[PDB]
Amino acid sequence: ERKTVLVIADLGGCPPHMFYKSAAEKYNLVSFIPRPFAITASHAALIEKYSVAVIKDKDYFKSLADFEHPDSIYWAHEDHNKPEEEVVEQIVKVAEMFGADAITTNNELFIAPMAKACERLGLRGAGVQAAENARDKNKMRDAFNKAGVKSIKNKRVTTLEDFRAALEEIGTPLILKPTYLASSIGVTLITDTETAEDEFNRVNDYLKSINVPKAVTFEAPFIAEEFLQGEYGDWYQTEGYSDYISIEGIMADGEYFPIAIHDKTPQIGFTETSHITPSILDEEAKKKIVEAAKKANEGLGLQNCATHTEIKLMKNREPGLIESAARFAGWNMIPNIKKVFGLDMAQLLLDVLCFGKDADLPDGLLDQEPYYVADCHLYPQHFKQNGQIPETAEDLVIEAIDIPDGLLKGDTEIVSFSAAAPGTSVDLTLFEAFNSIAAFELKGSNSQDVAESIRQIQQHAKLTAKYVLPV
Ligand SMILES: Nc1ncnc2c1ncn2[C@@H]1O[C@H](COP(=O)(O)OP(=O)(O)O)[C@@H](O)[C@H]1O
Ligand SMILES: C[C@H](N)[P@](=O)(C[C@@H](Cc1ccccc1)C(=O)O)OP(=O)(O)O
Ligand SMILES: [Mg+2]
Ligand SMILES: [Mg+2]
């Protein structure tokens, strides 16, 4: 007989078009929406369809205009001002209110509060400290160093003085990033000491302007850290991928169960472009990645959750840990694992949260892909790179994006292609990762052909649009 799962419904992780239908199959869902403005019209519709109960924070609603849902949201550009403890209390109350058996979220930002609520209720969860470890990058990097994985120098940074010391201890090149966000927001590579101060002041000012719930707490706002150098040629046998991978897994009563590795196409700066399900890497490479992710996620002390772990492919086949999340990967990675292997990770997670290791957990990475699926985005920068939009262009207005015939290698096909709606206005001022202007899916028998098709589409896609220039 059916169990009840509290989902903290917000942006990120497993996309609504899969999560709610997958969850509802065997579970009664209660949906808590702490941030009603973060819910798209289509997300809203899926929430009500598949939920036995829906609870929104009523304090957001002040007039009729508050009840409108946007068509598209990438990052929620509005304030949520409740302290962590108050958010925790809200989760526990909604859970008691409805007799919840489990709590899950797809949202990075509410991971730590969710953990506190779970343990306060005797339910399965990330573990209080482990979730903070998977959310505060200073704490994260520390746990990584103490675990058996590749260690790097790192330091907490709050003030300019902290940054200058960090630049003295650790050298050029160094990674400076906010400790508590996602989506590569604020993540900066400093390569020369002569303009390093200016860059820190720039990113410090920039950070103050990012909308984030007050419930996200942190030891220090920045981490300064060694840059993890990749060696493509030590890992991949063909071109088309990149220096890094993610690996998706599940933690179950403290044990790491790897599911799938994703290959990647080169990012734009630190903005991601494509994910390929599954990885083409050999069995020896995969084993190294799995070992790193096992040590890292167990090193965090994570108890019960989905896992999204990013790894830099370094010299001598050494896995370098970028970051790990106690939640599902974003974009279509989780649905694409289901298309390729037939495994529904959303159902698997809830099964683990309700039954522990009694769930149908795979031992080792899924294998015997019948083919490869690519999740790909296009950005204004692609159209600057290919000469269609000049560098100083302003306020792009997109009519259409079309893919010319003849760009696909081998048997690769376009399964779906979706451009921004005719007439949408894109602010070229925004951080690139916020500005996807098309999404497409590729399928093929041959990974290299898939990746090469991606590069071709990125190069040759035709934009129909208008932009502004100053005289
Ligand atoms: N120490 C590092 N060495 C090399 N690259 C890094 C490092 N930290 C971050 N990056 C790059 O920045 C991207 C985003 O940073 P990340 O640590 O994943 O934070 P988030 O994705 O949560 O913003 C990574 O995918 C990686 O490409
Ligand atoms: C694909 C990326 N690796 P991601 O999964 C992107 C986050 C972004 C996100 C968007 C809105 C709210 C929370 C997270 C997400 O979609 O959940 O994690 P990270 O690598 O950015 O940390
Ligand atoms: Mg993150
Ligand atoms: Mg990341």
UniProtKB/Swiss-Prot annotation:
Q: Which GO terms describe its biological process?
A: antibiotic biosynthetic process
Binding residue positions for ATP: K137, K177, S183, S184, E225, E226, F227, L228, Q267
Record note on what altering H308R does: Loss of ligase activity
- Any one GO molecular-function label of the UniProt entry: L-amino-acid alpha-ligase activity
List the catalytic activities from the record: L-anticapsin + L-alanine + ATP = bacilysin + ADP + phosphate + H(+)
Q: How does it assemble?
A: Monomer or homodimer.
| Protein name (record) | Alanine--anticapsin ligase
* Protein's organism: Bacillus subtilis (strain 168)
